[PDB]
């Protein structure tokens, strides 16, 4: 309950970033049509 | 000047992430000749569903003219309300502006009183006839003048935020 709990937490706070970065880094990825699509979605939703 | 019914106390805080206390204002309310408006003020200054002055500001400080406040909603003047709906008509014009320190419900056209009140740091004889009178400061004139002498930007707001930390009723 020291290595398995609080060490687990103090690593998962620095480990979840290592996963989230590469996870959100592998959406889109080129294909300029996708760039423009994701650029239009935000413009459209921001109109609210 | 007339009889006094209730006595309301206001805190005064300046500093602009947060307000340090500087003093304390104590005002009287003539519940004997303008009962509905005085009751509105006294109820706002205490509680009764949160529509109060706790955490308000003084969003207009015209040096040598007046200080206005009571917009607990937008801090810009276009907000604030009252217990009897959102507005109500004028009550009466018995008490008249006399000298340094009076209270007047800052209207937006006759018959449209609201939350915005204002204190007159100077004499205003011209103003009467179309503004209500429901209070004069009994303690804290110097703090009122200190606020009146605060630094102001182009919008006549104070450059250092002047909030009211706590407000309540203090009986005789």
């Amino acid at each position: 309950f020291d290595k398995g709990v609080i060490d687990g937490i103090t690593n998962g706070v620095g480990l979840a970033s290592f996963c989230i970065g590469e996870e959100i880094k592998y959406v889109g990825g080129g294909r300029i049509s996708s760039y423009l699509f994701f650029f239009l979605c935000y413009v459209s939703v921001f109109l609210f | 000047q007339s009889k006094v019914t209730n006595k309301v106390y206001f805190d005064i805080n300046i500093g602009n992430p947060v307000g340090k206390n500087v003093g304390r204002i104590v005002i009287g309310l003539y519940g004997d000749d303008v009962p509905q408006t005085v009751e509105n003020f006294r109820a706002l200054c205490t509680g009764e569903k949160g529509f109060g002055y706790k955490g308000s500001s003084f969003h207009r400080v015209i040096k040598d003219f007046m200080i206005q406040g009571g917009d607990f909603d937008k801090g810009n003047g276009t907000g604030g309300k009252s217990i009897y709906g959102r507005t109500f008509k004028d009550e009466n014009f018995q008490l008249v502006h006399t000298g340094p320190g009076v209270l007047s419900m800052a209207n937006a056209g006759p018959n449209t009183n609201g939350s915005q009140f204002f204190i007159c740091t100077v004499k205003t004889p011209w103003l009467d006839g179309r503004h209500v009178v429901f209070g004069q400061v009994l303690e804290g004139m110097d703090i009122v003048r200190m606020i009146e002498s605060s630094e102001t930007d182009r919008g006549d707001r104070p450059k250092k935020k002047v909030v009211i930390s706590e407000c309540g009723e203090l009986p005789v």
Binding site: F18, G21, E22, G28, I32, L36, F39, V43 | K159
Partner: protein, 478 residues
């Protein structure tokens, strides 16, 4: 009949000379124009030195601008170009490409950026972003035989066309709803004698303007175009963009959002915030996973660092603009230093990926030290300059009430420390059997040395000598 363009008329003169010399001279140009252009730049800087402490006097028929605050940025862009040209001389020299029109493009883009800093005309402030963007798809693709330099022309031209389109459509909506008006100051009048201000409409011409603004300086939700182009174009133009584009965009944004948008504060103060809170997050997480140097710099030094600049535009009662000026002055230097170091090492070796910077401390320690200094400064550590930059940016911005933007800023700065210290760790090493045969053959050893060494000490001294800079930056009313 006016000297308020003479700071740019000098630049036009130098442009015409640079175009002429190739038409007339034969081959004596290569090291000649290399300093002849610097003459024009320093002469324009001297010309701008005159108009210090001047009046808010209006322009030709009231067209672009002339006040103190705008003059600051007008000089700052010149500073960026003066520091950048010596970098983008030798680099393109060692590619056997024509050099004349490259310097011509850089000069014309700097001219467009200089004119943009004013432009209270609603039309000049439209042509000038094009004078700065039309001269950008060329540089950002001016290595034709390469392949990546074409991808970072397609997915830059398409994007910069769409965005300028959205922006000019917002401009047209404004011109319509405003009863017909262009002059930037004279909109809140004209939007009143025509009583259609508080109505829908304006709410659309605000978003269709803010989006086109964002794209030009790339916060998070529209950052998509930046990471690619910064990797596909040559490193010197990457630096030139990543300094002067941001400076010009942030100079135009504050004026286009503060002068004609008195009323809509509570509806764009929030809006920009939504960008900033994202810009300093999505521009950092990805920055961790990077392995290329240029792309990691795109993420960190731009994707994020365009956060705390904005971090006061929302919280501004004219008591903060000084802090924006100071942070821009710090950022220009703390960014050009590391770009100069990167250009130098890349040319000397021939690689970009991070895994080749190992052992560089032992082969040549001066370059490793002058790169570590700038990187740590970007990290924002106390004795350096970036620390005081971020500090005075927060201390005025916490002093303005908003809390859920300073905390995120400090947290993402702590997060950003990671990759800086990662590359720093990769510098200091001595495991001979680990260093690739790239730093192993490095004949260690003018222009680039001078730029790198005079740009790196300005990343350590001003952070401690910010007193006169602060006293100077407080006189901005625009």
């Amino acid at each position: 009949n006016g000297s308020f363009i003479f700071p740019e008329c000098i630049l036009i003169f130098g442009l015409i000379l640079l175009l002429m010399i190739d038409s007339t001279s034969d081959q004596k140009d290569r090291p000649w124009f290399y300093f002849i252009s610097s003459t024009s730049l320093v002469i324009s800087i001297t010309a701008l030195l005159f108009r210090w402490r001047e009046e808010p006097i209006i322009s030709f028929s009231g067209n672009f601008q002339t006040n103190n605050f705008n003059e600051i940025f007008q000089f700052l862009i010149l500073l960026c170009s003066t520091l950048c040209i010596p970098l983008s001389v030798e680099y393109i020299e060692c590619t056997e490409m024509a050099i004349t029109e490259f310097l011509l493009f850089v000069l014309t883009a700097t001219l467009g950026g200089m004119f943009l800093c004013g432009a209270n005309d609603l039309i000049t402030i439209f042509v000038a972003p094009e004078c700065f963007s039309l001269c950008s798809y060329l540089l950002s693709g001016y290595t034709k035989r390469d392949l990546r330099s074409n991808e970072a022309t397609m997915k830059y031209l398409l994007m910069g066309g769409a965005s300028s389109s959205i922006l000019v459509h917002g401009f047209s909506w404004l011109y319509g709803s405003s009863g017909g008006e262009i002059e930037l100051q004279e909109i809140v009048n004209g939007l009143i004698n025509t009583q259609m201000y508080n109505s829908p409409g304006i709410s659309i011409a605000l978003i269709s303007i803010t989006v086109g603004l964002g794209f030009k300086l790339s916060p998070a939700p529209f950052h998509q175009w930046t990471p690619d182009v910064y990797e596909g174009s040559p490193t010197p133009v990457v630096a030139f963009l990543s300094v002067t584009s941001k400076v010009a965009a942030s100079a135009s944004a504050t004026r286009i959002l503060d002068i004609p948008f008195y009323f809509s504060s509570n509806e764009w103060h929030l809006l920009l915030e939504i960008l900033a809170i994202l810009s300093m997050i999505l521009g950092n997480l990805l920055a961790i996973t990077q392995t290329s140097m240029k792309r990691m710099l795109a993420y960190s030094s731009i994707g994020q660092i365009g956060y705390v600049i904005i971090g006061i535009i929302v919280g501004d009662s004219n008591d903060g603009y000084a802090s924006m000026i100071t942070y821009m002055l710090f950022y220009i230097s703390m960014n050009l230093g590391t770009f100069a170091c990167i250009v130098l090492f890349g040319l000397r070796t021939g690689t970009d990926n991070i895994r080749d910077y190992a052992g560089l401390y032992m082969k040549d320690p001066f370059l490793a030290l002058s790169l570590a200094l700038c990187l740590l400064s970007l990290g924002g550590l106390p004795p350096l300059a970036g620390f005081f930059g971020k500090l005075y940016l927060f201390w005025c911005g916490w002093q303005a009430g908003l809390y859920f933007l300073v905390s995120i800023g400090l947290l993402t700065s702590v997060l950003s420390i990671y990759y800086y210290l990662k590359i720093i760790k990769l510098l200091m090493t001595g495991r001979n059997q680990e260093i690739t045969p790239y730093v192993r053959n490095y004949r260690r050893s003018n222009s680039i040395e001078l730029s790198m060494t005079v740009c790196v000490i300005a990343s350590t001294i001003p952070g401690i000598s910010m007193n006169p800079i602060l006293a100077i930056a407080q006189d901005t009313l625009f």
